Amino acid sequence: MSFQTLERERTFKNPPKDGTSFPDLQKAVKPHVDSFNALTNAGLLNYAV
Amino acid sequence: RCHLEGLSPAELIAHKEESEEMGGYFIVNGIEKLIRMLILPKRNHPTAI
Amino acid sequence: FIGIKLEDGDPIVAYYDESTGQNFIETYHGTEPGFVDEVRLLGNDVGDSECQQIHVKLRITRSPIIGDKFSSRHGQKGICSQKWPTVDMPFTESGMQPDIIINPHAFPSRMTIGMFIESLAGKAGACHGLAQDSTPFIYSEQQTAADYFGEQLVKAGYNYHGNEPMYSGITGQEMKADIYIGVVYYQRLRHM
Amino acid sequence: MIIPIRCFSCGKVIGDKWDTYLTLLQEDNTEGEALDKLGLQRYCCRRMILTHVDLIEKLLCYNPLSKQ
Amino acid sequence: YYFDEDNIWDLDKFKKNLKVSITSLDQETMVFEISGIDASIANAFRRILIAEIPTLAFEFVYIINNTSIIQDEVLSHRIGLVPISADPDMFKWFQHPLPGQEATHTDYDTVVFSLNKKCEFNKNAATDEKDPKRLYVNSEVYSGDLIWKPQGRQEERFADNPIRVVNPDIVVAKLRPGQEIDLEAHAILGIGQDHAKFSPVATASYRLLPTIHILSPIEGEDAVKFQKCFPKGVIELEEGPDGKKQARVADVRKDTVSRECLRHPEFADKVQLGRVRDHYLFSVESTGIMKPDVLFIKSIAVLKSKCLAVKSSLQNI
Amino acid sequence: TIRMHYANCNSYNADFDGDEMNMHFPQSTNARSEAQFIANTDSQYLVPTSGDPLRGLIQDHVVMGVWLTCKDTFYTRDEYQQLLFQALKPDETGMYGRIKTLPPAIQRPGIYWTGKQIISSVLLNLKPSDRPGLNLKSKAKVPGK
Amino acid sequence: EKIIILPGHSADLTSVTFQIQKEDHTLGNSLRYVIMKNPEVEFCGYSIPHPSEAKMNFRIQTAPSTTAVDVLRKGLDDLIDLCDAVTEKFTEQLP
Amino acid sequence: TMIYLCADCGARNTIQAKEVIRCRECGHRVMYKMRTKRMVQFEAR
Amino acid sequence: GRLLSVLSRLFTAYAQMRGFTCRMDDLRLDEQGDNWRRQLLENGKSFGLEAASEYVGLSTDSPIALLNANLEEVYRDDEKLQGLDAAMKGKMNGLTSSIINKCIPDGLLTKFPYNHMQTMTVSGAKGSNVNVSQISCLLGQQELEGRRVPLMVSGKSLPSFVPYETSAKSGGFIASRFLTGIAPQEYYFHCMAGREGLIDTGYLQRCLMKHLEGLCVQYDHTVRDSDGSIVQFH
Amino acid sequence: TTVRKLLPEAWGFMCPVHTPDGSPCGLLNHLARKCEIVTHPSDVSQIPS
Amino acid sequence: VNYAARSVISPDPNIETNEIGVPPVFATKLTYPEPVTLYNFNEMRNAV
Amino acid sequence: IEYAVKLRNGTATEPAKVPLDLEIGYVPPSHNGQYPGLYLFSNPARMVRPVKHISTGELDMLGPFEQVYMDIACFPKEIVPKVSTHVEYSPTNVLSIVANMTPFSDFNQSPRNMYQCQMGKQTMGTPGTALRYRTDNKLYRLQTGQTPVVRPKLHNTYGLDHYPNGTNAVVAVISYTGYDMEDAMILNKSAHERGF
Ligand SMILES: [Zn+2]
Numbered sequence A: 001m002s003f004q005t006l007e008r009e010r011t012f013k014n015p016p017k018d019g020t021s022f023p024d025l026q027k028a029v030k031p032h033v034d035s036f037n038a039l040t041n042a043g044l045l046n047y048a049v
Numbered sequence B: 001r002c003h004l005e006g007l008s009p010a011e012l013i014a015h016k017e018e019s020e021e022m023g024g025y026f027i028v029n030g031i032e033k034l035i036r037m038l039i040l041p042k043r044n045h046p047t048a049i
Numbered sequence C: 001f002i003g004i005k006l007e008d009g010d011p012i013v014a015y016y017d018e019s020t021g022q023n024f025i026e027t028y029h030g031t032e033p034g035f036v037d038e039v040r041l042l043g044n045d046v047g048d049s050e051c052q053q054i055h056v057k058l059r060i061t062r063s064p065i066i067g068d069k070f071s072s073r074h075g076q077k078g079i080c081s082q083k084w085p086t087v088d089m090p091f092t093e094s095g096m097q098p099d100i101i102i103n104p105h106a107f108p109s110r111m112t113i114g115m116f117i118e119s120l121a122g123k124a125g126a127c128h129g130l131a132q133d134s135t136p137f138i139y140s141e142q143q144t145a146a147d148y149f150g151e152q153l154v155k156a157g158y159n160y161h162g163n164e165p166m167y168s169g170i171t172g173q174e175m176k177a178d179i180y181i182g183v184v185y186y187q188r189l190r191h192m
Numbered sequence D: 001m002i003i004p005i006r007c008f009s010c011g012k013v014i015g016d017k018w019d020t021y022l023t024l025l026q027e028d029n030t031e032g033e034a035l036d037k038l039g040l041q042r043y044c045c046r047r048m049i050l051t052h053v054d055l056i057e058k059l060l061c062y063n064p065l066s067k068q
Numbered sequence E: 001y002y003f004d005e006d007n008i009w010d011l012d013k014f015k016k017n018l019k020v021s022i023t024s025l026d027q028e029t030m031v032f033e034i035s036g037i038d039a040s041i042a043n044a045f046r047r048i049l050i051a052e053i054p055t056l057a058f059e060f061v062y063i064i065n066n067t068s069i070i071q072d073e074v075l076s077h078r079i080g081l082v083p084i085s086a087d088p089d090m091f092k093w094f095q096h097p098l099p100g101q102e103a104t105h106t107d108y109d110t111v112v113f114s115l116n117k118k119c120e121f122n123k124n125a126a127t128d129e130k131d132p133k134r135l136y137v138n139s140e141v142y143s144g145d146l147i148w149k150p151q152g153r154q155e156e157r158f159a160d161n162p163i164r165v166v167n168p169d170i171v172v173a174k175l176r177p178g179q180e181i182d183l184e185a186h187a188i189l190g191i192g193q194d195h196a197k198f199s200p201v202a203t204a205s206y207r208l209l210p211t212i213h214i215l216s217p218i219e220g221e222d223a224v225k226f227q228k229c230f231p232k233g234v235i236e237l238e239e240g241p242d243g244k245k246q247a248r249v250a251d252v253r254k255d256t257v258s259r260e261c262l263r264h265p266e267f268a269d270k271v272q273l274g275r276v277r278d279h280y281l282f283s284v285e286s287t288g289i290m291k292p293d294v295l296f297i298k299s300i301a302v303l304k305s306k307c308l309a310v311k312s313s314l315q316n317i
Numbered sequence F: 001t002i003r004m005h006y007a008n009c010n011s012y013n014a015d016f017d018g019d020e021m022n023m024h025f026p027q028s029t030n031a032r033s034e035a036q037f038i039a040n041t042d043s044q045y046l047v048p049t050s051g052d053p054l055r056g057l058i059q060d061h062v063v064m065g066v067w068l069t070c071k072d073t074f075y076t077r078d079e080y081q082q083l084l085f086q087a088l089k090p091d092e093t094g095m096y097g098r099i100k101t102l103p104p105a106i107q108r109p110g111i112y113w114t115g116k117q118i119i120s121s122v123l124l125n126l127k128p129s130d131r132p133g134l135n136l137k138s139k140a141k142v143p144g145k
Numbered sequence G: 001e002k003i004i005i006l007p008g009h010s011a012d013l014t015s016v017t018f019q020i021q022k023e024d025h026t027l028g029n030s031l032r033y034v035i036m037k038n039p040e041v042e043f044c045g046y047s048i049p050h051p052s053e054a055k056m057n058f059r060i061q062t063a064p065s066t067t068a069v070d071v072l073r074k075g076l077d078d079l080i081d082l083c084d085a086v087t088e089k090f091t092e093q094l095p
Numbered sequence H: 001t002m003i004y005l006c007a008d009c010g011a012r013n014t015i016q017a018k019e020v021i022r023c024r025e026c027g028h029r030v031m032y033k034m035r036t037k038r039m040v041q042f043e044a045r
Numbered sequence I: 001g002r003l004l005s006v007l008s009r010l011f012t013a014y015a016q017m018r019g020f021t022c023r024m025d026d027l028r029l030d031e032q033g034d035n036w037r038r039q040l041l042e043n044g045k046s047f048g049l050e051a052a053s054e055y056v057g058l059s060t061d062s063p064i065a066l067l068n069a070n071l072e073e074v075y076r077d078d079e080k081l082q083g084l085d086a087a088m089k090g091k092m093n094g095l096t097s098s099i100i101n102k103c104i105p106d107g108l109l110t111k112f113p114y115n116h117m118q119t120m121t122v123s124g125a126k127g128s129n130v131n132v133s134q135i136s137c138l139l140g141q142q143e144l145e146g147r148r149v150p151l152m153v154s155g156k157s158l159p160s161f162v163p164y165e166t167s168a169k170s171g172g173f174i175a176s177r178f179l180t181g182i183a184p185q186e187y188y189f190h191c192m193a194g195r196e197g198l199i200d201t202g203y204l205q206r207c208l209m210k211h212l213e214g215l216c217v218q219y220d221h222t223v224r225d226s227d228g229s230i231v232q233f234h
Numbered sequence J: 001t002t003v004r005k006l007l008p009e010a011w012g013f014m015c016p017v018h019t020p021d022g023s024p025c026g027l028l029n030h031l032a033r034k035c036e037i038v039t040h041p042s043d044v045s046q047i048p049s
Numbered sequence K: 001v002n003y004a005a006r007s008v009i010s011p012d013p014n015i016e017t018n019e020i021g022v023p024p025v026f027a028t029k030l031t032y033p034e035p036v037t038l039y040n041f042n043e044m045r046n047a048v
Numbered sequence L: 001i002e003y004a005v006k007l008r009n010g011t012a013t014e015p016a017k018v019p020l021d022l023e024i025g026y027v028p029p030s031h032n033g034q035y036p037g038l039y040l041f042s043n044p045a046r047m048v049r050p051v052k053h054i055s056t057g058e059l060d061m062l063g064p065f066e067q068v069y070m071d072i073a074c075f076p077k078e079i080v081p082k083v084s085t086h087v088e089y090s091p092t093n094v095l096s097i098v099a100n101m102t103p104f105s106d107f108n109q110s111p112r113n114m115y116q117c118q119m120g121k122q123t124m125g126t127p128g129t130a131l132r133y134r135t136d137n138k139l140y141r142l143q144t145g146q147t148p149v150v151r152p153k154l155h156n157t158y159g160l161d162h163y164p165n166g167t168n169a170v171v172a173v174i175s176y177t178g179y180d181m182e183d184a185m186i187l188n189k190s191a192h193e194r195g196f
């Protein structure tokens, strides 16, 4: 493996308009964010009330 | 329920959040608060004690 | 002013009372020279509010000073003791001075052998241009990563045991013993 | 931030050698050893332009005086 | 009480054994060989060459307007590192200003450069190519934009040799539409052991001439492996009608003394790795100020100077 | 930053990572004389728990002492003089006029001193004016084998 | 004050300890290596009290034949002569 | 008066003391102070 | 005090002149001693099951299911655990002391004087022989609070092992050395040992100091407290 | 010597080494690398069927 | 109390096992009384 | 698992007969053991980790109820047939993020690695990129950063190229100075003024 230089540069220079370049990070934080969604959606609060 | 979900790093740069924003904290008074994960016993399984 | 150097006994901001019509002041609690990188006029509310909140972001400079802590990525924390003169430092046959000198009295009783592994791997990957991969539980007891990097380095031309003959910076004449030199990743602490 | 001119270990200045080495990997198809064409005989001042992060081209896209 | 009757000083004899040869010289590189010299004197030579000769380097920076992203002190320091092409001997030292310090400038001490750039958004852009070299104009504050400002007679005294930054190509900072940096730099004579920016030589080191000598002649594969052990050139495979192959040291100077052969089990008995005790191989690399030969001559000159100064004060008492 | 010697590390047991200290100074003359004579660092060599001394040299000193002391060592006149002076530095201490040495252990084909001669020499340099030299036999740490 | 006599000097001015100001081994080691080339030197060793300052305590002990000032004088001179020989030779090498 | 920078719109606002604070062109309610030209001197260490 | 100071600066200067470093090869054993380690480990490849069958009472060629029932029956209790592990620990320790006695004095590359780590160890400077043993030979049994690795409900030491696994590899004994590296299954138990050593890691000084304030040595050499009453003579 | 011990049911679930030292040593442990938490249940009617 | 500083320590092998090397800052900020006799007069006067 | 490999790919994605989240806590019987009983759980908020089911070649998820009863091999090499029913994706999958981002972490005595995590969480690196709009109390940023020469691959995968925390130093282990004992260390003056 080599340091992704051209990747890193043509990453920085033009930020990606498609999606997050590092999905593993979003997955790493996935717990809380999905907790919030399942709160609002997923008929969670409506069950509580 | 934020205006940042689904956003690509590009428009995140259009706002003043870094390219790989994570989300996961409630912003109160400005300071990044967070609810810790805590361990409970198992759901609904009768445990011996 | 934006970017003006402050000191301790120095006003930062000035507000006056309306009724009394007298100016008050705010001094810099901190006790090190700090500048100001930007000041921010916080709209106090939804609107229709005079600027009742201001935000100053002071930038403090901390070069590596005597008494601060360094650590490789092995828990091998150290302390900046004297900042030796660059000429009194020894040198390789190529001559580049050792940017950081640590002691051999740290590795026994600390078992930080992966440090030596990382050192050799760095010495190789730097020369060839390789991003040395070091994922745990790849290298087996059949071939030690030691021997793999030893191949890398003997290909580089250096010693297989990472050693390198050094001349005393102060006496000039070489040491009786070869010396271990590599390229570790050092980050700085902030506890100081 | 920026490529640190006058490397720590070596005494060679390298700050000039950043975009000149970038457009070697970029369009010369040679791997990192294009720096050998640059003339970094050691490894010391060599390991800088190799694994230097040029984060500042991403920090600069944050002008609040962007007028837009 | 012992002098050994051979530790004597004989300027004639020392000089008659002393031999110099300049292997390679350039504008920036130099390597040469000295002989019949003790460790102390070569040590001292490296010692002066590294730090102990003065050289113009930016010291103060009067900032005028800097709205950039890089912090000011960082900008100042980074500039404080770019070299400066000017005769270091055509100057007179800066008397560091004690309290009562303001008026301590002249035109025989220091030099001033300046820069001021506001990256304007370039309107000739077709579409979005975040180069951004072509999207914006003057986005990169290089070293080629630190213009020397003459100070009186300087303009005339160096009219034959106009002073400039020796590398007009370094990128000093980076800018974007709206922001600006404006400042001027003050550069004086300073000695390396005061600040590294005053060390003129990029890299100065000397190697004791290593000697490689086999005791027993190796043969065939061991000869092949042996030549393969050390870098190429140092070992020749002996073209032997008697026997088939031996190895001999062609040029011990190309050799790196990494001591790889000694690692192999069987080779350990054949060869011994000594080093010449008296012969030195200097490798000199200045930065942009002076030519390495002038560096060498100036260094020894300064050592003579220090000898003379101690001598003069010794005469005093 | 306040600087002290290693040999005090052990007694203060401080790990020299940042652990700060209090630095006191007696005002009167009697208190300073008392600190100077009774509780001077030099008068704290045997801990009170048992007679075992705790102040003394550490990893680097014991290491290179082992190396140098080994009989395989040798020194020309240059090394011997430079090293003897380097250890002495009497001026920073005072109380001493001139340095005395020993003859070389070997003379032919060349003069050479051994590190063991060196230790003897330094021990001689501090020999009190009239205090008989030291005679002693005691086990070393490194086993003989 | 460039070079000063320290108060540990012998009455006979045979064991004086020169204290060179604003100097380090650059001159020290060369000086001593030259001095050890003098048969009339019984002792020659340099040190440094502390690197933070630039002071080098120097030492000369010699036979009662000649004192230390002349010894240091001639040693400096011989070293300068070495400098000149080196310079001359090297300069002659290149054109 | 004072001259500031509308954070988002990036527009000089020229607001005065004891005044409602907001961008005049877009309506933003956060504004930085511009950096005037102020003599500051640094060592190169 | 002077003598200490001068010896200090002395060895200091010697450090400037000579040089001393702990390079890599001072850990890599000789291939002869390397395969010595190999032979002895391959021998002890089955010691664990040996001590197991012995302590339980069955023989080494006993049926697998019989020993299975026995082991399940064993470490539902704890005393049975204590005795079993005690046996296993003595056994592994015998093996360990064995291969250590064989390798470290001569199996490694360069001999005592030139080996810079042998020096820093045997000279009392820093480290010990157990350190070179671990780094260069093996790690041994991982005594955590006495016995060893604890057994989970299914009695398997680890989801890497089968239940009622007997091999010392699953018994907290691991063979690898630091020099080459350790296997994940070993890494886990070793982490357990370390972090246990962590969680294992002054009011008396106002008790034993309270009544012991005075206790001074009066001139008559009859040591009292300051009130007048004796505590000791001489 | 309670839960503060690393009882060996964490292999791949929560990191062995990643844990502060001092008093809160052992108490707070971080998750392993890949271990997720399912947060969105599903219908299981076909499970009893 | 008064006349007692508080600082971080770093070791040093050059100085002494006895003496402690102190930065000049404290030498300035730590002072103590001294009667003046006739013979110590020149020292004290110089310090003044 | 089978319907999983179907629904993932082109196969029609019906309401899953048997979703992946559900954990099958089959508890074999034994004296003085856990009360044996099949235990199917579909509740959210459970610890669930993936491995590869060895019979098929597909993904598998289970929680800390089947672990204690499952023979999951650590290595494709370790598998003993007819008993070992699962294989770890990789031993990597046992460590956390920061502890995994550790050169040859399987070498040092574990307390060192533990200090390594606890202190490396306290490093003077970049805390992010968008600093201009951070209203925090105290942040810390280091000016001249570079990625290591030695690294685990996941340091590139996880996008750690965008938060360097240190540099790469020319280290030489040597007892030369005499000031670097009791763990102490020296810093080359030149490399320090040069922007260390
Ligand atoms: Zn370099």
Ligand SMILES: [Zn+2]
Residues within 6 Å of the ligand: H006, H007, H008, H009, H010, H022, H023, H024, H025, H026, H027, H028, H029
């Ligand atoms: Zn606005």
